[model samples]
Target chain A: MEYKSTRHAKYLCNYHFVWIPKYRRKVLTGEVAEYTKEVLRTIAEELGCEVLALEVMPDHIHLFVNCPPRYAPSYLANYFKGKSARLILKKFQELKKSTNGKLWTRSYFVSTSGNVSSETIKKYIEEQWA
Target chain B: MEYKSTRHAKYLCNYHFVWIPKYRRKVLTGEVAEYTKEVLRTIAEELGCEVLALEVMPDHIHLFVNCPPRYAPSYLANYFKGKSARLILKKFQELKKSTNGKLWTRSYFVSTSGNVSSETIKKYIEEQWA
Candidate 1:
């Protein structure tokens, strides 16, 4: 129920998105976890979006972002996943073969915030699984 | 509800818990975040409890755990907070002063997940704020 503003737009562009690593790999630990967080932050900055919250678990990832109007959640999900996989494979060459030309599952979960306060979303984001 | 059986008991133990960094600092980025996650996972393993879900934000943490009856949430919160803070401060010396001798807020939020399907909780945990 909130909006952010740019010169021409007064929008509250927030989304709660979830995706998984290919084969639901537990590789999302150690250096990879840190690297993923950085990659997402950088990508969001490049897109003029803000990554409000993010958690990378062994099998899945939870990302809450304030997206610009120009980008769709589906598009951003694929874009980020694709970009990260490419970057990650380059860094950890062994992952490429394990994942077989993919890094994320084909589907992702997306939810639109209509009247929920960012605080609620924040608390929701703060909650997690082992 | 799901139960874990030990020698003398069959207990259904689960909790959804939350806590914030001292002064709600956004210092939980990159290395700090990864370190925290590993620390918690290690602690959970040592305690014989399972970390069901965990998300470390810039300021707060969402940790879902299946705790044994021996340890109360209040006690575990303080224990983990104190433990992690003590360890984190050692690793990130600069964070100690920035946080002013504290790592987590005194208050924590905890909810007992009784009669709730693990899947429902997982779905809820899968959701987030951006």
Candidate 2:
């Protein structure tokens, strides 16, 4: 199903949302790979994002990021994924040591919510690391 | 939206459907990269597919495959993409030199029809190479 990037409406992010994208294989490690994590942190630090939890697995990644009402969550998500994809390909030399030729898949999963209800989102994020 | 990988029943595939799945960069040019093209060709030959057109762009790919009634087009597609993803990641050493750390994206586009309305599919596929 092809989704037009236009349909993503403006969202008032009151609580937090979670998203995960899996790679084709397990090839994530090392200094260059770490740059992706650093990028996310920088985005959160300067762009008013609260990265509650993040875990970059060998073949998949899980992240929970909080934002204010004015923040564009969808754009932010795309930015992070797009930038990460580009960066990974650029650093494929280091990556070649781990997995195959591809970087990211075309599909992704995103779930939105009103609030944390009972901090379930927070717990899930924490569990990703623990 | 995630497709359930179901409903792709047995198809005659008289009229070919030309679809393209692009990567995130221009890294798709190498021995492992060429392996993708070869895989598709091998499948087309073995599965009684009529190869129409194929072009691998810097950030994307285009392919047209024809199938007979006994073959499963959808399954064939999944198999093609899945295998390519795995192969690319496995050969990241060559892949890394070209592009990022990702392999394939989760989203894809698949268009199907009954027959060759005007050989449009074939012509379209051909033009991609030209």
Each candidate structure's TM-score, on Cα atoms with residue i matched to residue i, is 0.45, 0.34
| lDDT computed for candidate 2 | 0.45
- Per-residue CA lDDT of model 2 for A94-127, tens digit only, reads 5644445445544333322232222432332233
Q: How large a fraction of the reference contact set does each model reproduce?
A: 0.00, 0.00
What's the lDDT for residue A60 in model 1? 70
What digit string (tens of lDDT, one per residue) describes model 1 on residues B14-128?
A: 5555667656556899999999999988888788889988888886777777765456545666667778988899999998987887866655554444432336325533541
User: TM-score (0 to 1) of chain B, per candidate?
Assistant: 0.82, 0.57
What tens-digit string does per-residue lDDT give for candidate 1 at A1-130?
4444344222444555566765644778888888988888888898887887788887677777766545644567667777877888788778777877777765555443333334754653354210
Q: Report the number of the highest-lDDT candidate.
A: 1
Least lDDT summed over 10 consecutive residues: which range in candidate 2 chain B?
Answer: B1-10
